Hints:
The complex is a heterodimer of chains A (317) and B (160).
Chain A: E1 2-7, E2 15-16, E3 24-25, E4 29-31, E5 33-34, E6 41-43, E7 50-52, H1 57-62, E8 74-75, E9 79-81, H2 98-107, E10 110-115, E11 141-143, E12 154-159, E13 166-174, H3 178-185, E14 192-195, E15 200-203, E16 219-227, E17 232-237, E18 241-244, E19 246-251, E20 258-259, E21 265-269, E22 272-274, E23 277-279, E24 285-286, E25 293-294, E26 298-299, E27 306-308
Parallel strand pairs in A: 5-24, 6-21, 7-9, 9-20, 24-26
Antiparallel strand pairs in A: 2-3, 4-27, 8-10, 10-19, 11-18, 12-17, 13-16, 13-18, 13-19, 14-15, 14-17, 22-23, 22-25
Chain B: E1 22-28, E2 31-36, H1 38-59, H2 75-126, E3 130-132, E4 137-140, H3 146-153
Antiparallel strand pairs in B: 1-2, 3-4
Helix pairs in contact in B: 1-2
Subunit structure (chain A): Homotrimer of disulfide-linked HA1-HA2.
GO molecular function, one term (chain A): host cell surface receptor binding
Subcellular location (chain A): Host apical cell membrane
Amino acid sequence: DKICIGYQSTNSTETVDTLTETNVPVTHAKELLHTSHNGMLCATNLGHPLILDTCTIEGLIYGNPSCDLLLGGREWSYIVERPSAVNGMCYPGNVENLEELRSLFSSASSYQRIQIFPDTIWNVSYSGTSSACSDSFYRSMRWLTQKNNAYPIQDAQYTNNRGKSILFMWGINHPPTDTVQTNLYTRTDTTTSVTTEDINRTFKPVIGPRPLVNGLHGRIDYYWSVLKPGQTLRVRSNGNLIAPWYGHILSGESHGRILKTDLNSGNCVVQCQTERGGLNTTLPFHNVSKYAFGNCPKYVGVKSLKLAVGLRNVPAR
Amino acid sequence: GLFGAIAGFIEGGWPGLVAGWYGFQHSNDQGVGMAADSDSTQKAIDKITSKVNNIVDKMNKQYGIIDHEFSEIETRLNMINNKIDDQIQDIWTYNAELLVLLENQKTLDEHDANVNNLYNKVKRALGSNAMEDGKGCFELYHKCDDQCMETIRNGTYNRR
Ligand SMILES: *[C@@H]1O[C@H](CO)[C@@H](O[C@@H]2O[C@H](CO)[C@@H](O)[C@H](O)[C@H]2NC(C)=O)[C@H](O)[C@H]1NC(C)=O
Ligand SMILES: *[C@@H]1O[C@H](CO)[C@@H](O[C@@H]2O[C@H](CO)[C@@H](O)[C@H](O)[C@H]2NC(C)=O)[C@H](O)[C@H]1NC(C)=O
Ligand SMILES: *[C@@H]1O[C@H](CO)[C@@H](O[C@@H]2O[C@H](CO)[C@@H](O)[C@H](O)[C@H]2NC(C)=O)[C@H](O)[C@H]1NC(C)=O
Ligand SMILES: *[C@@H]1O[C@H](CO)[C@@H](O[C@@H]2O[C@H](CO)[C@@H](O)[C@H](O)[C@H]2NC(C)=O)[C@H](O)[C@H]1NC(C)=O
Ligand SMILES: *[C@@H]1O[C@H](CO)[C@@H](O)[C@H](O)[C@H]1NC(C)=O
């Protein structure tokens, strides 16, 4: 008679690696890496994303006339800018510190427009439009021009009593010829200032034709800033000012992402979202994307992370 | 392996041991049979289950990388940001890969140790009443029926 001690063997095909041996057969193992995603842009625990299919972030901020669907205000978990989004700054010109503007905007979770300077305050024309901007103009600013062949010094003030900071925008027009300059502002030498308790910005125009953009030789240099609660914004100009009309009250904190993809969006909710798709999992790691956000596992750039649970699988035969 | 039992002096596993990782096989007049040792198997199950749970809890924290936009004159900042991201990824991937490789070795060796400890427990209990065949079995010097075999399995063998 006899009694023997032994251990289990199974038909498991699982294998794991160690530092002193690779592909060690084991009876039981656990994959710690999640590798699947749904191939869609979904909502996260913070809500649905703001999907911009025709307008860019700056186009929305400055109120490109082709982005009216966005005038009402939105809230989001993250922002998606489709490759089809081409409506930005319709009138030729660049936004100073654009990357910071887009970052600031995307970091918030919502915006609501607020009127800064009512059309009635001006003593000059304010309905200027352009063929480059759908025969209209930005909803965030007014292109002030001469009225009755006169352009008196414009001096307007606005005090922020909303309790929240206000992102505001303005621009400086640079005509292509001296005729357009005088024609629009009555004078060729102007001075414009945008000031608050913290900023003291002044601008001067420079007439001349720039290379053609959207069929125009003229330009508008775009600028922005943030009016803190209690602060007062004051603008003065005797020409060339593209005055602030409406600003934005930014609130909250979103995931702070701007995804640039044409990935399909869906009526879904996920814990973790990436630019390639979203996922749900209790595994500690994933290899979908280092850019993942939301409630996510840790990203690891590997194909598998198999942890041994059982023992070395040794066939008797 | 480190403890010399699994794929060691006990040359192969048993496909007939369905209930657990470690067990006993006996041979007497009444026949041959095997069953898992519940005590040793359950203790091992609890330990590895805790290790898995702790690894998950310690390693599931995400790190955040935002694909920041940079202007044409921020190329240095762009490179510095990329350096940060590349190293965050490389360091964590190394930590994850190594933790798994190293703990895997320990896990396999711990199973080996459990088999070794069970074998030594029986050897000690049997004393001079049995001889080791060198392959994981103990050849008893006296007849041992099923009830006798049970005292060996549950650790109450009388003759230790
Ligand atoms: C447009 O003109 C009106 C009238 O000249 C300006 O309003 C006056 O502003 C002064 C100084 O700010 C005040 O003392 C008066 O009480 C205001 N009177 C009126 C008519 O409201 C107004 O400021 C001008 N707007 C701009 C943009 O310069
Ligand atoms: C992934 O997890 C999310 C939540 O973590 C799941 O979303 C739920 O979807 C149902 C659909 O009827 C809603 O009723 C719940 O309110 C949602 N949860 C919350 C609180 O947002 C989602 O279904 C999961 N997706 C997968 C992979 O099945
Ligand atoms: C993430 O992990 C997967 C799974 O290991 C990687 O491997 C691919 O997985 C799919 C589905 O299992 C297979 O059909 C492919 O043949 C695998 N390709 C290979 C050889 O890697 C996948 O590549 C990983 N993804 C990333 C982003 O690296
Ligand atoms: C180990 O096995 C032995 C034998 O099966 C058990 O001893 C028996 O215990 C029952 C209790 O109901 C008695 O009626 C029998 O007379 C005992 N058999 C003999 C002759 O030894 C013992 O209880 C078991 N011990 C453990 C820890 O389970
Ligand atoms: C295990 O594999 C062997 C050989 O392929 C086969 O004969 C046996 O039936 C299998 N046992 C299981 C897991 O059913």
